[PDB]
Symmetry: D2
Subunit: 264 residues, 4 copies
């Protein structure tokens, strides 16, 4: 059982400025509910009980949201159940040096165990099938190796994401042969894009500590995974469910509008 889920939330969110100068992008609402809460509910379903959060300058709002306070009830029951059932842990990333560096800072909260990772700006809704992390948690029980979530996208979208090169194993399961962070579409090894959902074995921490800066001069978890994938097998998983890239303004709006209609 993967008991810990690490949530990186120390990124600038330069694109949602000026509000991200105070409110982490992971705290932005889809209308009435922050991205991070959906992520937490997801991790819970997957079986996690310890939500480890890596924070930046804007630690306050994130931390206060998950601390004790006070169809109203309806709106507050889930966050209340979250606060009661989960143990929240926090560590501060001293400098914005990349996603990989964030996860490496998170070592203080994880220790020597495989663990889950959720990039909250990727809102994944699947409510017909188990949550995305849960799908991967079940896969992990069989494979016992790092797992990276993937989705087919248009080549025109590739330069925004990590892209793999994999060899089919079973339905929707690939053994990652190679990975590249944000390639030009001409250089993209496939249309299989990485999404903010991973299950990582702890040897990943030692690998991160020796992973140099890459794309945008940031320590990328992609390069660490590429290294791991060349020492032993790690898999990529085409999850079932809907994903909105809320790290993008386009995705943020479409998720908000979708929710609005659902609310009807």
């Amino acid at each position: 059982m993967i008991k810990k889920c690490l949530f990186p939330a120390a990124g600038y969110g330069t694109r949602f400025l000026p509000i991200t100068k105070t409110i982490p992008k992971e705290m932005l609402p889809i209308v009435d509910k922050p991205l991070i809460q959906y992520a937490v509910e997801e991790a819970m379903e997957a079986g996690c009980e310890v939500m480890a959060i890596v924070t930046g300058r804007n630690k306050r709002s994130l931390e206060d949201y998950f601390d004790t306070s006070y169809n109203k009830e309806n709106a507050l029951k889930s966050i209340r159940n979250i606060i009661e059932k989960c143990c929240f842990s926090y560590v501060r990333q001293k400098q914005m040096k990349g996603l990989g560096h964030a996860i490496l800072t998170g070592e203080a909260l994880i220790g020597n165990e495989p663990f889950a990772v959720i990039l909250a700006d990727d809102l994944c809704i699947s409510h017909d099938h188990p949550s995305v992390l849960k799908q991967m948690t079940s896969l992990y029980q069989k494979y016992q190796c790092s797992i990276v979530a993937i989705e087919e996208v248009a080549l025109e979208e590739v330069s925004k994401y990590g892209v793999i090169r994999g060899e089919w194993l079973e339905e929707g399961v690939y053994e990652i042969k190679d990975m590249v962070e944000k390639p030009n579409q001409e250089d993209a090894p496939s249309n299989l894009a990485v999404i903010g959902r991973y299950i990582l074995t702890p040897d990943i921490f030692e690998i991160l500590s020796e992973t140099k800066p890459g794309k945008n001069n940031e320590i990328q978890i992609t390069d660490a995974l590429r290294t791991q994938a060349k020492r032993k097998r790690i898999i990529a998983y085409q999850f079932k469910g809907k994903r909105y890239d809320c790290g993008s303004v386009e995705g943020y709006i479409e998720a908000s509008n979708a929710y609005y209609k659902k609310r009807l």
Copy 2:
């Protein structure tokens, strides 16, 4: 002239629950900018230099936002830093949620014996070729030297969500209020002229507020005190020029968000 502008920001904003349990509704972003920043910019253009805020349970986000901090990251941060170095922010806590009228009364400590502006940031006002709604009102005030409340004609099916006036046409877009009613059913609406979150208030409004008893939804309403003033002397209603989105409602919040995005 009007140098202070009171910003009530201590209501529950329940329909936006659970995020409002930590993030006040005035802090919700259209996409990248919180409602309150638009209101503040509108107050500045109107000549205000003191931004007085009535806080509730979660003022941490507000105070943090207007406190100094550290291409389009530059252009995204230009106005806010201008606001922070230019304006003077003061604060007072509304002990209990007893109505917009009480929040204004509580705001007396920050105002004193002087006419002032009041902005309800949940009403996002966009004036493109015209001055900000408050600036328009500021001009009016120079002539009339009396309370002024912003109105707009709305379909009668909406009249039940707002305060409504019965008035005498003084001049182009100007009426003398002879009565006001907070949230009447369609059957009883005095007219289709609804009140929006913009007011200029003479200071005798505080003693009136001091004697105003709970009204609609067991809340001390600014509408009821304005009715009292209206019957003691002349106050006016101004059909402002410009587009207003009621972001106090999810439907308005969503429309404003879609609007800003298309303009991006």
Copy 3:
């Protein structure tokens, strides 16, 4: 009746570094109670109902302290709770540390055109055989209707840490101020009547502050503004009754603490 009291609390408190990088010096406890609570309680006894606080970077400790959160806990809590339920707290941020004078000028947005009280919390005043210091002053304002600044006689050796006045005796404990100087060297002191952190100021003090240039330590001094006011019209100095500890200094901080302990005992 003076209803508002301004509490400057935006200073650095350098002598209490590193703790003052997070906890403003006015929040430092005498053992179990921060300096500022004693000040607020004193203002309340004087009749003030609005506690206008000028903040700096350490606002959080101050703001949270006076906000709602709550014979064991009880008795130790009754006072602060009474305070939080009866008083109205307002805040303004002194954008930059430019001096007590500029801190009070920044405080104008919370005061307005009315006379008001000012308390410098690092000056702990205990005097319960008589009314609190500020209240002694509030009574005096009723008569004189002008600015009042608290003074205490000190040794020529301490004179250099305070503002000092030159006055003329009007009546018991009252002096019409003829001149004021901030932190004069022991040789240049006009007297031994040193100013302490307590004032009642008439509203014209703001306009005077707006034209007061940086004085000692390149900071705008309320002292220089009071000197200006004193030469313009009548303003007095009141020799208060009660004991005062300069908790603005580590020596006075320790003394008051030991003093309180010997009492808690």
Copy 4:
């Protein structure tokens, strides 16, 4: 070696009420320095690099204190050093259910590894000797078992501390036979009182899980240590150095006066 140090800071501090309403007692200043800063310096000297803090209802002041900010320089040298060298982690103790429970909560920040624990209200000032934790860190190296700092106190004081029953192994080292939390004078098994300094082997977490409320209906680390002591060998170390119980106002005052004189 021991890389992490746990710092419980979630207790009520009813003693120092009202200020402890907003500020944790571990944050109370001696004169210009908060208790917790002395403890962190001590831990650092002991070789610790991860400072794991267990927080309560008032974490803002403690977290902000150890977060980047900006003789003023002589005053900020240490904390600047600390903030730039240490890794601080946080976890919330939901209900104040005792020191042992606070430590159990800290499991998420520790994991399965030996770790140190410092109760910051116990101010330990080592003159010519290394820090109390450094002394213990060295001892563990030899013993490889839980270590609990002790001090011989006066019998009339015994009732406010955990007390051991031990057997002399070597200079200032006792194998613990039993432990009781805050026994009355008449029932004290000795005059060797526990002080807020421990090195603990990870099996203490499971034991703590099984430890029911004891003294003052609180889950006590002393009872978990007692259980560990009967289960296998653990030691008590009579440290070299001066200790003030700043958990009591009398101690707080004495420490403040002492620091003042150092001038």
